[PDB]
Amino acid sequence: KTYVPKQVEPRWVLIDAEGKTLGRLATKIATLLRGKHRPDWTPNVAMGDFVVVVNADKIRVTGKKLEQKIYTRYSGYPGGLKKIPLEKMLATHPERVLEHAVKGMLPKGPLGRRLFKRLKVYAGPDHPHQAQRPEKL
Amino acid sequence: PKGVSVEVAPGRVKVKGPKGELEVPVSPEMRVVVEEGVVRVERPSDERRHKSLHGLTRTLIANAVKGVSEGYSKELLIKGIGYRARLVGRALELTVGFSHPVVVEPPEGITFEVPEPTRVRVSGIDKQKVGQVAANIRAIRKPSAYHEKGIYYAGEPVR
C-alpha cells in the first residue's frame, strides 16, 4: 500500500532570471511549483518549493516576441478586450510576464491557486531576505 | 588615419582626433585589428549576413575617423522671393512663407554657419547628425513641385 507522506516544511528557492529564456525558466519554475522534482511526491497535498525570482524584469524572449507577443485580457463590457503586448508589459510591471507564463502552466484548479501564493517574483533584484533563500541555478 | 587614436572595447570603438571623440558602437562578432597606423576589420565567416556586417563597420568606422579628421559640412540652398536665412547667434532663423519666421534649434555637436541667406552650411563631428540635422532643415519648407521655391541641396531641383 503506497506511501502517503505527512507534514513537510517548504523550501523557498532563490532564482535569478537575468538572461534566462522565458518559458524555459517558466517550466522549471512550475515543475518546482509542485513537487514533481521530490519523489516524496504527492499530487494533491501541495508541497512545492516556494519559488522566488529576482530581476524578473530581465527576461530574454525569442524571435520578435517583445514587439510581437500579445497578452489578451477581457473584462465584461463590449470591446473590453484590452490588448497588451510584451513591450508595454516589461516597461510597466515586468515581473508579471513571467507570472502568467507560470500560472498558465500550473494545474488549473483549487490547489493550483495554492501553487501561486508560492510564487514570489520581483524586480530589483532584492526580495524578502526573510529566513530561507536556497539559491538554485 | 593620420593623427588619430583608434581603440578597442567590448562592444564599441572610440575615435580620438583634433575635432573630438565620438562613440561608435559596432558589431560584436568582428575583429577590430589596430596596427601601427592603419585600421582593419575581419569577418568570422563568409555568410550572407556576415558580408553585410563586415562592409558596414568597414565604412562606418572609416567615417567615425573621418568625423574627426577634417569635419563634415552639409550645404543647403535657399531659393524664393522672401526666402532668406539669418544666424541669430548659434541658432539659425529664417523666413520662408508660414505666417511666422521659424527658428532652428542648435543640436549638440553641430554648429551651422552661413555663406548667404541662400546658402546654408552644417558642420558636425558625426556624419549621422550632419545628415539628420540637415534634412530636418529641408523638412520645414519642402521644394516647390511647380516653381523653384524652398529648401534644396546641390542636388538638382524638381521643375
Partner: protein, 204 residues
C-alpha cells in the same frame, strides 16, 4: 496643485461691467492642514484639509489625539487635495485670485431609484396609438439567441444621483477674504449646505 474645501451656500447672479454673471457661492472658511503625506513614509504627496469647527463632544473619538498631534481645533470633516503642500499654517481663499479658473467636485442630488427616461434621457414610447403599457419603458434590451446575454452596463433603471461628480474650468468671479466666500460661474453640483472641494484647473 492648489486645493481648498467648502460648502454650497446658495447661488444668484451679479453684473460685471454691464454684462450679467450668474454666480454660485462657495465657502472656504479657514481650513486647517490636518495631516500631510510625504512619500518618505506615505507613498505620495497630499495635504488633508479639515473643515467646520466642532465641540469636543462628538470628537470623543480618538480623532482628538490626531488634532492634538497637529495642534488643530477639532473639526468635523477632512479630505485630501492631491499634492497640495502650502506652508506650516492654514489655507484661506487667498489661494485663488479673482479670474483664476477652478475645477469643482461635489456629490450630486440623489434622485432616488429613477427611471430610464430620467437616468439616460431615454426615449421610451409613444403616448399614443397602442401598447399603453410602455410609455416610459426601456424597450428591448438584447438580441435573439446570439449572444443570449445582456451587455454588462446596459443603460437600465437604477439610481440617478448621489454620485461623485466634478465640473471644471470655472471662472472664479470674486473672492471675499473679509468673510471667506468664493464666486464661481454658477453650475456646481450638490444641493445647498453641500460639501465640495475646489482646486486649480486643468488648462495647461
Amino acid at each position: 496643485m492648489k486645493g481648498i474645501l467648502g460648502v454650497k451656500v446658495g447661488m444668484t447672479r451679479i453684473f460685471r461691467d454691464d454684462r450679467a454673471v450668474p454666480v454660485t457661492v462657495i465657502l472656504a472658511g479657514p481650513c486647517p492642514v490636518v495631516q500631510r503625506r510625504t512619500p518618505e513614509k506615505d507613498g505620495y504627496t497630499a495635504v488633508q484639509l479639515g473643515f467646520l469647527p466642532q465641540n469636543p463632544k462628538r470628537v470623543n473619538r480618538p480623532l482628538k489625539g490626531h488634532f492634538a498631534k497637529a495642534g488643530v481645533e477639532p473639526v468635523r470633516i477632512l479630505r485630501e487635495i492631491r499634492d497640495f503642500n502650502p506652508e506650516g499654517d492654514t489655507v484661506t481663499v487667498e489661494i485663488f485670485k479673482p479670474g483664476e479658473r477652478v475645477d469643482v467636485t461635489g456629490t450630486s442630488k440623489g434622485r432616488g431609484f429613477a427611471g430610464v427616461m430620467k437616468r439616460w434621457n431615454f426615449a421610451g414610447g409613444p403616448d399614443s396609438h397602442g401598447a399603453h403599457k410602455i410609455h416610459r419603458h426601456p424597450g428591448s434590451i438584447g438580441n435573439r439567441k446570439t449572444p443570449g446575454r445582456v451587455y454588462k452596463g446596459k443603460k437600465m433603471a437604477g439610481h440617478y444621483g448621489a454620485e461623485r461628480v466634478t465640473v471644471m474650468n470655472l471662472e472664479v468671479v470674486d473672492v471675499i477674504p473679509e468673510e471667506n466666500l468664493l464666486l464661481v460661474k454658477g453650475a456646481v453640483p450638490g444641493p445647498n449646505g453641500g460639501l465640495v472641494i475646489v482646486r486649480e484647473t486643468k488648462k495647461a
